[PDB]
Design a protein around this nucleic acid. Structure first.
Ligand SMILES: [Zn+2]
Ligand SMILES: [Zn+2]
Ligand SMILES: [Zn+2]
Ligand SMILES: [Zn+2]
Lengths: 72, 72
DNA sequence: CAGAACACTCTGTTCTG
DNA sequence: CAGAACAGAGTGTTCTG
């Protein structure tokens, strides 16, 4: 496939176990080892797409997890 | 109140008609004047508080207008 | 492919008449 | 008070093993 399983932007290959775009790749790496205080403002099922992926990083991260992205 | 009617943060007085913090004051004018494409990732009722006011500018603008802000 | 180093978005603060 | 404008976190792209 050529679409990111997380946001639907054009995929640049398989990153951390899942086919993702470059911004989802580094969002995930940064989420896992960084210092964020993400919090959903809706009901933990925000729509994650290219247009809205910056809106709820907390749902973005959860969607990354469910798709199976991992470091290990 | 010292409280912002849009986001609950400590308010710096009445701006464009409504008691607001400084961030919402300048968020509101930037929104209205420079219209661009804000879209809710939930169901257009995102909680707007200090921790989460960057998440959904569409709802943030929506709460601003309801609360009564304007430039006229 | 994983990471680094860059550049961008947008926001929020401080300063002013 | 409204507005100018600098500084910042968070994000995204380009590049370099
Ligand atoms: Zn993506
Ligand atoms: Zn969410
Ligand atoms: Zn506010
Ligand atoms: Zn919303």
């Amino acid at each position: 496939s050529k679409i990111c399983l997380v946001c639907g932007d054009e995929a640049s290959g398989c990153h951390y176990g899942v086919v993702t775009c470059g911004s989802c790749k580094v969002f995930f790496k940064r989420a896992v080892e960084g210092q964020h205080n993400y919090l959903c403002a809706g009901r933990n099922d925000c729509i994650i797409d290219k247009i809205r992926r910056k809106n709820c990083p907390a749902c973005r991260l959860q969607k990354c997890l469910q798709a199976g992205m991992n470091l290990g």
